[PDB]
Amino acid sequence: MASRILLNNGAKMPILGLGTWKSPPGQVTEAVKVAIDVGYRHIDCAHVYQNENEVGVAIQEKLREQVVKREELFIVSKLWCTYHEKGLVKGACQKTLSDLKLDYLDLYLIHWPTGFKPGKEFFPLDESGNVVPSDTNILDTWAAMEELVDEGLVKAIGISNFNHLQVEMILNKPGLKYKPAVNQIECHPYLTQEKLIQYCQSKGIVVTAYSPLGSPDRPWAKPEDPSLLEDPRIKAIAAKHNKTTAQVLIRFPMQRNLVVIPKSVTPERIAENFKVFDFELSSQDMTTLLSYNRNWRVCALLSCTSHKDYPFHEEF
Numbered sequence: 575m576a577s578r579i580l581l582n583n584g585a586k587m588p589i590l591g592l593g594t595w596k597s598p599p600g601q602v603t604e605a606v607k608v609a610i611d612v613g614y615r616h617i618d619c620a621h622v623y624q625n626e627n628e629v630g631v632a633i634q635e636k637l638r639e640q641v642v643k644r645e646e647l648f649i650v651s652k653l654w655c656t657y658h659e660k661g662l663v664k665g666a667c668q669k670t671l672s673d674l675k676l677d678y679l680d681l682y683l684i685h686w687p688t689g690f691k692p693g694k695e696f697f698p699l700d701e702s703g704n705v706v707p708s709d710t711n712i713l714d715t716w717a718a719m720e721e722l723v724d725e726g727l728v729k730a731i732g733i734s735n736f737n738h739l740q741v742e743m744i745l746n747k748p749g750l751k752y753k754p755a756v757n758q759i760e761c762h763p764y765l766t767q768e769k770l771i772q773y774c775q776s777k778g779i780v781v782t783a784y785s786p787l788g789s790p791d792r793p794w795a796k797p798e799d800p801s802l803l804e805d806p807r808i809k810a811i812a813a814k815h816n817k818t819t820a821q822v823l824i825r826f827p828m829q830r831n832l833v834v835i836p837k838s839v840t841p842e843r844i845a846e847n848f849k850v851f852d853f854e855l856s857s858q859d860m861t862t863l864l865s866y867n868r869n870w871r872v873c874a875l876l877s878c879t880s881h882k883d884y885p886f887h888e889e890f
């Protein structure tokens with residue numbers, strides 16, 4: 575299987591990338607350096623992760639060392655919810671570019687479909703704990719994203735955590751100039767996303783699977799939640815293939831024509847997670863993994879559930 579997938583902007587995107595949410599700022603520079611040294615060419619970032627400066631130090635060092643050329647890297651970031659307004663989008667993108675020490679992003683995503691009140695706080699709340707919306711809509715935010723392409727700041731634009739109706743709304747936008755290249759969504763054997771993936775793929779939108787290992791370090795994990803990495807059924811498939819459970823969990827979305835972005839700051843795991851191009855899951859393995867769906871989400875957030883554009887009320 576090829577290492578990159580063709581996007582609807584004509585550029586190629588590596589199907590395996592390194593995630594950076596929760597990567598501590600004192601560890602992520604080395605994580606990204608190691609990743610690039612062992613073959614990663616795609617890094618998934620976001621302003622809200624609060625570590626783009628440190629990610630950028632690694633990228634810049636590897637560019638300066640001439641380990642890789644800029645054209646060989648595929649750097650992704652995301653516009654946070656408090657920057658959905660027309661007059662804030664460019665500055666938000668530029669702050670990310672400055673922190674990452676880049677002059678363009680390969681892909682810039684609307685992180686969530688919901689706009690929040692601008693200000694210092696990433697999650698502005700009312701006194702009862704509800705997020706405070708902005709009156710921005712996904713269509714006007716999209717137009718602002720299109721401007722970034724036309725200004726040379728980003729090579730591609732896309733969306734993240736958009737449900738099927740929201741994807742449809744973008745595709746049906748009056749005067750749409752650029753289609754979204756990517757929809758980045760949670761996807762793993764407990765949240766298999768058949769409906770939304772089929773819709774996006776049918777429209778030429780590439781899907782990136784986040785939390786492919788079930789995000790065991792998510793800060794709201796409860797001791798009781800289901801655990802992909804410990805599921806004996808998945809362990810059995812891994813054993814059959816002489817691979818680790820994580821390697822199976824990474825290979826799974828790859829064979830569905832998805833991009834996948836496992837996170838690690840552990841050098842041995844960063845390397846392990848990349849060793850997924852020399853084995854194949856059978857069709858029976860794939861269908862068996864799909865059968866584990868339980869509609870379980872890592873990424874949901876009560877404080878945001880009443881926002882008009884919160885994505886997870888719809889079935890898909």
Ligand SMILES: NC(=O)c1ccc[n+]([C@@H]2O[C@H](COP(=O)([O-])OP(=O)(O)OC[C@H]3O[C@@H](n4cnc5c(N)ncnc54)[C@H](OP(=O)(O)O)[C@@H]3O)[C@@H](O)[C@H]2O)c1
Nearest residue numbers: 593594595784785786787788789791820836837838839840
């Ligand atoms: N667009 C969005 O809204 C959104 C939401 C969630 C995630 N994402 C992106 O997707 C990335 C991945 O998702 P995620 O961070 O939620 O979780 P994940 O990649 O599913 O899991 C990361 C966890 O798995 C551990 N791990 C990594 N490789 C392992 C291995 N080979 N064996 C055992 N454990 C391993 C990591 O530990 P160590 O790091 O300690 O090694 C970390 O605790 C994020 O970092 C972010 O870039 C985007």
Ligand SMILES: O=C(O)COc1cc(Cl)ccc1C(=O)NCc1c(F)cc(I)cc1F
Nearest residue numbers: 595620622623624686688873874875878884
């Ligand atoms: O959104 C991500 O990329 C990962 O999740 C988070 C990352 C940070 Cl730095 C802070 C918060 C979260 C988080 O709570 N994510 C879940 C979440 C939202 F942040 C925002 C919405 I709108 C819905 C939702 F489920």
